[PDB]
Amino acid sequence: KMGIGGLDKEFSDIFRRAFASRVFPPEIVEQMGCKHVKGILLYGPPGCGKTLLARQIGKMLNAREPKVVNGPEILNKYVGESEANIRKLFADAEEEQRRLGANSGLHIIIFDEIHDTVVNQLLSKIDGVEQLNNILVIGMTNRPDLIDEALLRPGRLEVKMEIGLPDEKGRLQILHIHTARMRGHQLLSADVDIKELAVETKNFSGAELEGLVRAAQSTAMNRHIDFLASLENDIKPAFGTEDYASYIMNGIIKWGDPVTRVLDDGELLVQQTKNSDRTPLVSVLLEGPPHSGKTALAAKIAEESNFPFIKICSPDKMIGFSETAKCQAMKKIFDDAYKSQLSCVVVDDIERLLDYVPIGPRFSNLVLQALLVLLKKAPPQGRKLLIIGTTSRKDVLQEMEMLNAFSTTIHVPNIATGEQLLEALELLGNFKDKERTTIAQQVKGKKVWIGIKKLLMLIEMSLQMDPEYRVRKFLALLREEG
Amino acid sequence: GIGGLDKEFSDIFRRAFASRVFPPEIVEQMGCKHVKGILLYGPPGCGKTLLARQIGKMLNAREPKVVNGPEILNKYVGESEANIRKLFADAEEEQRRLGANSGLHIIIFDEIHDTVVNQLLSKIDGVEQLNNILVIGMTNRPDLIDEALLRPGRLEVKMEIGLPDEKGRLQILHIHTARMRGHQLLSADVDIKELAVETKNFSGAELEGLVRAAQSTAMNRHIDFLASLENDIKPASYIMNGIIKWGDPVTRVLDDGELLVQQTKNSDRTPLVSVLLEGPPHSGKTALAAKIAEESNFPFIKICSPDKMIGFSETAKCQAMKKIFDDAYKSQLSCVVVDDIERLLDYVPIGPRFSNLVLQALLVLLKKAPPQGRKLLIIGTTSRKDVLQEMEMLNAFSTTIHVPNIATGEQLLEALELLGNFKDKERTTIAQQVKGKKVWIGIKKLLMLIEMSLQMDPEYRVRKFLALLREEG
Ligand SMILES: Nc1ncnc2c1ncn2[C@@H]1O[C@H](COP(=O)(O)OP(=O)(O)O)[C@@H](O)[C@H]1O
């Protein structure tokens, strides 16, 4: 009954159904009058530890199959030839079966990362022309959609299994075996708790667990020459299932009353998400003058939300990509969003993302489509997502039906009031307590239209110059910017 | 065992086999040369293969059956072509050695250019003889295959099969089940007739397969029924909310849709009817279309989603449309629901940018009808009826249905009521703020704003609702 964390109900049903039909001895099958199942296939999110489950299932099934492993290339050797190899590993099993065919020989073959002749070749051997039963094959792959339709139909690959999101209980099981083995030996860390580690991590793949533990062992080794495990949690992954420090370089200072209101509105939106059975997908956008500060805000809302899976989207990664490539990466993030039950994703600089250009205007249709469908597109039942898009220009986006898509729109306006500007200055703490007073004297009777990103940059600009100069220069700079 | 296909199968069977069967002077009295081959084209899952193996078995004590790999032509250098010629060669050799009477060889090509075309054609017919053998070809689509083979002679008879007859389906399930019956063990809950009524599409093969999954399932249990559970799981998502009926128009559209269905299924005169939904987003029309599809209970109903097609090349989108639609043809009748009509095009108002090629593929097919003995209904959802008419595609669609989201206050409250989110008091206040006035919001944003309001404290919910609805106007 070991070892595989979580995946017990689904695994149990699948297992008993594939193995049991074989297991009942021996008249029952004839009583059943049913030919044995040909293969079982599993598709999972990456890192869900599909492979370990498969090796284990194969081991459990027979005293010794004894396991057959297929290289990823599969088809290596061009001249004839490789195709023949894919046929050939099957060939040994079929040969044994013909030599002893009736009962009772089983051979297990597994293809990891599963066109022309090879498609057909696998299909012919797995089913027909005559027999080819008494063996089973399991295929493990990250995405269902990529694989061929013909294999799927009941028969050659009758049963398809989709791996469940990793269990908390399960997470406790995988960590529990390594930890326990350590427990069994006298050495252990008192501070570390199994339940606690499980509650702390939701996203991680199996693999991840051995990795975290291994890093902890290494740090411990370092101590000899929380603790090590904590250091590992802090660094080691690389999980693949969010750095906000790269999107909030400058702190969400409560510069203006509007700032607090934009964030509370972000709070309102997350709260909207929390249940939202009636609406599965939450779409939100921030619209601001350039240098608006909308995007840091979006990132901050995401940090605040702490939904189980958050992945940042960057214009910068997209740069220099083919329009199709741009669509593709974006697609991959979209499916990644699918995995979490409650989830938040960021789309940023969408005008920039689109490659939208003022002259023309010229823009990317394919990119626009991926973007358009997504808001409309529905996450698998259960699991939900909120999308935050930061857009510099509201009207063009409204113009392409993009605005229509969003559930909520938030516009971030640069404060038009000097005193609020002052409040901002005070929070940033750039100017001396004298300078704040001076700015306060100047602002009255004057109207300011400047962005926080722009304001902070402006401030910073005024500051470098000498102290008598800073007050005058900043005022002049403000005047020019106005 | 072969489910359904007893009349058609019987006639075909008789015509190929009987002409051979009458012994032996009768054929000369007929004075007709024996038929060369029989070819069958079926929907996927039509169990063509089993019928063929069975037919071959039935025909001779032992042919004994020849199977052709899908590649057929594997080995480039000379060579493969020669192989396609060569399997024929053994049969011709036997026939020359004993030619007159009485040797028959059966060869079957599953999933049936240059030299191979000619090669198969030359061996099957001419130059001299080549009779005393028969070949059956099994393929999913008729249109793909070559014209030359089809003409009477080399492939005189072409058979098209409409899935498995209900009585027949009962026969195949009945044999495996009966064998199960004969032994003491059986499932009381499972009924033969019931299984037959439940399944229309499935191949024989499918039946042994289903039984297999269920047996495997009994097999799951010891250390309707199982079949029902399989229907429940083994192979809703689109409309998680379900549909409220706020206005007589909302209900009226689902009813009109039901009427379109009735017409499509019921009436011979028009093979096809097109159902069109007109709304401005964020309209719920997409949902209405799904509903329409569900009440119909058409044997095959498929709703196609752009996201499934997302990021595809022009050709790929077009191919998907072709595939779905080919799938629909094969069934006696079907309802196909088309979604995001603007998006398939990838129309963008700036530009204009759109893909013409895809537009022609949809436009041409829509007018197009399945082969006789079958009828279909196509439903599409369009954001922008005006742009569509401007294409002139709209003229092509059989019927137009338009709902402008929610337009009156009565319709609004009726929706809030069917959804049941606000308290009697709250709705009593909302009505006092909308009744008489004009509103204009699609159903889904409503489902959204409602949730955006349930988020505020028990007293700030109503006010927040009226604020949101005040913006979505
Ligand atoms: N209320 C706010 N919303 C967004 N960003 C803010 C806010 N207040 C302060 N910031 C700061 O603004 C900066 C980000 O500006 P950015 O997101 O690039 O704006 P834009 O997208 O309008 O160009 C961050 O460095 C962050 O510390």
mmCIF file with all atom_site columns, N, CA, C and O in Angstrom, chain A residues 46 203-205 208 237-242 309-311 332 336:
data_model
loop_
_atom_site.group_PDB
_atom_site.id
_atom_site.type_symbol
_atom_site.label_atom_id
_atom_site.label_alt_id
_atom_site.label_comp_id
_atom_site.label_asym_id
_atom_site.label_entity_id
_atom_site.label_seq_id
_atom_site.pdbx_PDB_ins_code
_atom_site.Cartn_x
_atom_site.Cartn_y
_atom_site.Cartn_z
_atom_site.occupancy
_atom_site.B_iso_or_equiv
_atom_site.pdbx_formal_charge
_atom_site.auth_seq_id
_atom_site.auth_comp_id
_atom_site.auth_asym_id
_atom_site.auth_atom_id
_atom_site.pdbx_PDB_model_num
ATOM 1  N N  . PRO A 1 46  ? 2.674  19.165 -14.881 1.00 0.00 ? 46  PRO A N  1
ATOM 2  C CA . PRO A 1 46  ? 4.031  18.654 -14.703 1.00 0.00 ? 46  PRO A CA 1
ATOM 3  C C  . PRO A 1 46  ? 4.487  18.569 -13.263 1.00 0.00 ? 46  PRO A C  1
ATOM 4  O O  . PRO A 1 46  ? 4.110  19.384 -12.414 1.00 0.00 ? 46  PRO A O  1
ATOM 5  N N  . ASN A 1 203 ? 1.297  23.776 -3.655  1.00 0.00 ? 203 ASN A N  1
ATOM 6  C CA . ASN A 1 203 ? 1.604  23.642 -5.082  1.00 0.00 ? 203 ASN A CA 1
ATOM 7  C C  . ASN A 1 203 ? 2.490  22.456 -5.429  1.00 0.00 ? 203 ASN A C  1
ATOM 8  O O  . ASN A 1 203 ? 2.303  21.822 -6.462  1.00 0.00 ? 203 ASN A O  1
ATOM 9  N N  . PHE A 1 204 ? 3.448  22.157 -4.560  1.00 0.00 ? 204 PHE A N  1
ATOM 10 C CA . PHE A 1 204 ? 4.591  21.319 -4.923  1.00 0.00 ? 204 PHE A CA 1
ATOM 11 C C  . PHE A 1 204 ? 4.264  19.901 -5.353  1.00 0.00 ? 204 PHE A C  1
ATOM 12 O O  . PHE A 1 204 ? 3.421  19.206 -4.802  1.00 0.00 ? 204 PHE A O  1
ATOM 13 N N  . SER A 1 205 ? 5.020  19.544 -6.377  1.00 0.00 ? 205 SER A N  1
ATOM 14 C CA . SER A 1 205 ? 5.133  18.218 -6.944  1.00 0.00 ? 205 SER A CA 1
ATOM 15 C C  . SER A 1 205 ? 5.876  17.255 -6.025  1.00 0.00 ? 205 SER A C  1
ATOM 16 O O  . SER A 1 205 ? 6.540  17.683 -5.080  1.00 0.00 ? 205 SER A O  1
ATOM 17 N N  . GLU A 1 208 ? 9.575  17.600 -5.741  1.00 0.00 ? 208 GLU A N  1
ATOM 18 C CA . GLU A 1 208 ? 9.776  18.823 -4.942  1.00 0.00 ? 208 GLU A CA 1
ATOM 19 C C  . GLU A 1 208 ? 10.056 18.567 -3.488  1.00 0.00 ? 208 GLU A C  1
ATOM 20 O O  . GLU A 1 208 ? 10.853 19.239 -2.868  1.00 0.00 ? 208 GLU A O  1
ATOM 21 N N  . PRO A 1 237 ? 13.434 26.081 -4.326  1.00 0.00 ? 237 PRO A N  1
ATOM 22 C CA . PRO A 1 237 ? 12.588 26.112 -5.514  1.00 0.00 ? 237 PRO A CA 1
ATOM 23 C C  . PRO A 1 237 ? 12.265 27.539 -6.034  1.00 0.00 ? 237 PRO A C  1
ATOM 24 O O  . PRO A 1 237 ? 12.110 28.434 -5.199  1.00 0.00 ? 237 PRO A O  1
ATOM 25 N N  . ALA A 1 238 ? 12.168 27.793 -7.353  1.00 0.00 ? 238 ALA A N  1
ATOM 26 C CA . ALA A 1 238 ? 12.445 26.896 -8.493  1.00 0.00 ? 238 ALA A CA 1
ATOM 27 C C  . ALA A 1 238 ? 11.356 25.833 -8.626  1.00 0.00 ? 238 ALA A C  1
ATOM 28 O O  . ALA A 1 238 ? 11.500 24.857 -9.363  1.00 0.00 ? 238 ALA A O  1
ATOM 29 N N  . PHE A 1 239 ? 10.281 26.028 -7.870  1.00 0.00 ? 239 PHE A N  1
ATOM 30 C CA . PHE A 1 239 ? 9.150  25.114 -7.864  1.00 0.00 ? 239 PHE A CA 1
ATOM 31 C C  . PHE A 1 239 ? 8.498  25.095 -9.239  1.00 0.00 ? 239 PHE A C  1
ATOM 32 O O  . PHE A 1 239 ? 8.105  24.039 -9.738  1.00 0.00 ? 239 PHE A O  1
ATOM 33 N N  . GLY A 1 240 ? 8.386  26.270 -9.847  1.00 0.00 ? 240 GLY A N  1
ATOM 34 C CA . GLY A 1 240 ? 7.708  26.411 -11.122 1.00 0.00 ? 240 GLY A CA 1
ATOM 35 C C  . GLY A 1 240 ? 6.232  26.684 -10.939 1.00 0.00 ? 240 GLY A C  1
ATOM 36 O O  . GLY A 1 240 ? 5.524  26.991 -11.896 1.00 0.00 ? 240 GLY A O  1
ATOM 37 N N  . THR A 1 241 ? 5.766  26.564 -9.701  1.00 0.00 ? 241 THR A N  1
ATOM 38 C CA . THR A 1 241 ? 4.419  26.988 -9.346  1.00 0.00 ? 241 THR A CA 1
ATOM 39 C C  . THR A 1 241 ? 4.460  28.089 -8.294  1.00 0.00 ? 241 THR A C  1
ATOM 40 O O  . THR A 1 241 ? 3.449  28.407 -7.671  1.00 0.00 ? 241 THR A O  1
ATOM 41 N N  . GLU A 1 242 ? 7.007  34.097 -9.248  1.00 0.00 ? 242 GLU A N  1
ATOM 42 C CA . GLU A 1 242 ? 6.088  34.812 -8.375  1.00 0.00 ? 242 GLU A CA 1
ATOM 43 C C  . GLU A 1 242 ? 6.798  35.918 -7.601  1.00 0.00 ? 242 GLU A C  1
ATOM 44 O O  . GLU A 1 242 ? 6.275  36.403 -6.616  1.00 0.00 ? 242 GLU A O  1
ATOM 45 N N  . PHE A 1 309 ? -1.939 29.616 -6.501  1.00 0.00 ? 309 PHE A N  1
ATOM 46 C CA . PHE A 1 309 ? -1.024 29.758 -7.644  1.00 0.00 ? 309 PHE A CA 1
ATOM 47 C C  . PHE A 1 309 ? -1.139 31.163 -8.236  1.00 0.00 ? 309 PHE A C  1
ATOM 48 O O  . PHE A 1 309 ? -2.203 31.599 -8.685  1.00 0.00 ? 309 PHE A O  1
ATOM 49 N N  . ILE A 1 310 ? -0.005 31.857 -8.221  1.00 0.00 ? 310 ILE A N  1
ATOM 50 C CA . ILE A 1 310 ? 0.154  33.149 -8.863  1.00 0.00 ? 310 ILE A CA 1
ATOM 51 C C  . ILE A 1 310 ? 1.374  33.194 -9.782  1.00 0.00 ? 310 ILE A C  1
ATOM 52 O O  . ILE A 1 310 ? 2.496  32.946 -9.336  1.00 0.00 ? 310 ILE A O  1
ATOM 53 N N  . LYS A 1 311 ? 1.167  33.504 -11.056 1.00 0.00 ? 311 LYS A N  1
ATOM 54 C CA . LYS A 1 311 ? 2.303  33.679 -11.950 1.00 0.00 ? 311 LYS A CA 1
ATOM 55 C C  . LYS A 1 311 ? 2.235  35.022 -12.633 1.00 0.00 ? 311 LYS A C  1
ATOM 56 O O  . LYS A 1 311 ? 1.239  35.372 -13.262 1.00 0.00 ? 311 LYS A O  1
ATOM 57 N N  . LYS A 1 332 ? 0.636  28.810 -22.426 1.00 0.00 ? 332 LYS A N  1
ATOM 58 C CA . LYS A 1 332 ? 1.233  27.947 -21.428 1.00 0.00 ? 332 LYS A CA 1
ATOM 59 C C  . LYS A 1 332 ? 0.935  28.509 -20.030 1.00 0.00 ? 332 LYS A C  1
ATOM 60 O O  . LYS A 1 332 ? 0.515  27.755 -19.138 1.00 0.00 ? 332 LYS A O  1
ATOM 61 N N  . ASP A 1 336 ? -1.293 26.916 -16.923 1.00 0.00 ? 336 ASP A N  1
ATOM 62 C CA . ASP A 1 336 ? -0.715 26.807 -15.578 1.00 0.00 ? 336 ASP A CA 1
ATOM 63 C C  . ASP A 1 336 ? -1.666 27.349 -14.532 1.00 0.00 ? 336 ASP A C  1
ATOM 64 O O  . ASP A 1 336 ? -1.803 26.784 -13.426 1.00 0.00 ? 336 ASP A O  1
#
